[PDB]
């Protein structure tokens, strides 16, 4: 799929395989490593005994939403009318990076008002703004779509 590309990477891959346990000892490694796409691997590395416990890290569940928020909010000055369950319902089908992002959006919302304390009103509002990017419902009333 690229004559020059495939072989350069390929040579790297099969070196890393030699050292991982091809001959030379692992050296108590303990890899640990990460991939974004599982289907993109060559047959050699994919298999168990190159990484013995192949683990799916999914996108978090409904409860997982709630657990990530809890951690993050200790970092912030915390809601005053706390409820992590409501947010989790709306954010379901996001990622962990998105729980992080919403918290970031929540604090800055506080800077903008010049309140400089995060509260529930700030949290619900932040959730709306970040999910706004990620959903394509808003706009536009016609003219012809009315």
């Amino acid at each position: 799929s690229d004559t020059s590309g495939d072989r350069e990477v390929q040579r790297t891959m099969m070196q890393l395989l030699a050292e991982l346990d091809g001959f030379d000892p692992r050296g108590d490694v303990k890899v640990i490593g990460a991939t974004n796409r599982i289907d993109i691997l060559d047959p050699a590395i994919l298999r168990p005994g190159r990484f013995d416990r192949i683990i799916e890290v999914p996108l978090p569940t409904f409860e997982g939403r709630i657990q990530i928020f809890k951690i993050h909010t200790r970092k912030m000055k915390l809601a005053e009318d706390v409820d992590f369950k409501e947010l989790a319902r709306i954010t379901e089908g996001a990622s962990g990076a998105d729980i992080k992002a919403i918290c970031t959006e929540a604090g800055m919302f506080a800077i903008r008002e010049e309140r400089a304390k995060v509260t529930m009103l700030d949290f619900t509002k932040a959730i709306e703004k970040v999910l706004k990017k990620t959903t394509p419902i808003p706009d536009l009333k016609g003219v012809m779509f009315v």
């Binding site: 419902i137 808003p138 536009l140 009333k141 016609g142 779509f145």
Partner: protein, 242 residues
């Protein structure tokens, strides 16, 4: 890139043809209409706050007669409404011709589901980008939503548009099938208020209903809508505090 919405003749590998859910999105972006169904009739309320004052602000129409005893309302493209309402008017009359009964609320709804699915199934013609409320009294008050997909949903109350979601929630709390006509009208005016996020005017909404003791289509006149609206603004104000 996806290619499951480049046309409509496809699905994704998830099993979800994205393009007919995108015709659904056409509906959300367009503008509100509410059907509120009680046992004394069905009420149909739809936006007429459309445009500026350059426009006619008694702009025709969002409250279409299909007969004298079945009515319909819209959200989505009102190009695609104008022609679907046209199709719907011939369809109801064809029943009258070949059977000579009031076409029934169920039967109009199923014919129009068939009609949307003709466009949906072929690729040489796009789906409709319109959703419809069919409200009538055949002899039992009835309310249906027909999707851009061609699917049929019976509801106790139903809304479409921009404001769809707030209305769904609004009724989630108050609405009951035991509620009067007076009561049912005023509650749907409160909900119509939330949809546009502002206080109501009786020159800004167009209202029809099909009544049970008439069994007829009637359109609410400007100064007869004014007290229903008048009491609603008080409740609307309290809700806009939040």
């Amino acid at each position: 890139q996806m290619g499951y919405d480049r046309a409509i003749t496809v699905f994704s590998p998830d099993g979800r043809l994205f393009q007919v859910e995108y015709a659904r999105e056409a509906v959300k972006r367009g503008a509100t209409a509410i059907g509120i169904k009680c046992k004394e009739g069905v009420i149909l309320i739809a936006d007429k706050r459309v445009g500026s004052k350059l426009l006619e602000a008694d702009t025709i129409e969002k409250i279409y007669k299909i007969d004298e005893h079945i009515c319909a309302a819209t959200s989505g493209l009102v190009a695609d409404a104008r022609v679907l309402i046209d199709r719907a008017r011939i369809e109801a009359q064809i029943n009258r011709l070949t059977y000579d009964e009031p076409i029934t609320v169920k039967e109009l709804a199923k014919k129009i589901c068939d009609f949307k699915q003709q466009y949906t199934q072929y690729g040489g013609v796009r789906p409709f980008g319109v959703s419809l409320l069919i409200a009538g009294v055949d002899e039992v008050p009835k309310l249906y939503e027909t999707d851009p997909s061609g699917a049929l949903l019976e509801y106790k109350a139903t809304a479409i548009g921009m404001g769809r979601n707030a209305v769904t929630e609004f009724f989630e709390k108050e609405y009951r099938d035991d509620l009067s006509f007076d009561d049912a009208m005023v509650l749907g005016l409160v909900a119509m208020g939330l949809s546009i996020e502002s206080e109501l005017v009786p020159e800004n909404i167009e209202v029809g209903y099909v009544k049970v003791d008439d069994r007829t289509f009637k359109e609410v006149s400007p100064e007869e809508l004014k007290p229903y609206v008048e009491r609603a603004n008080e409740r609307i104000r309290e809700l806009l505090k939040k």
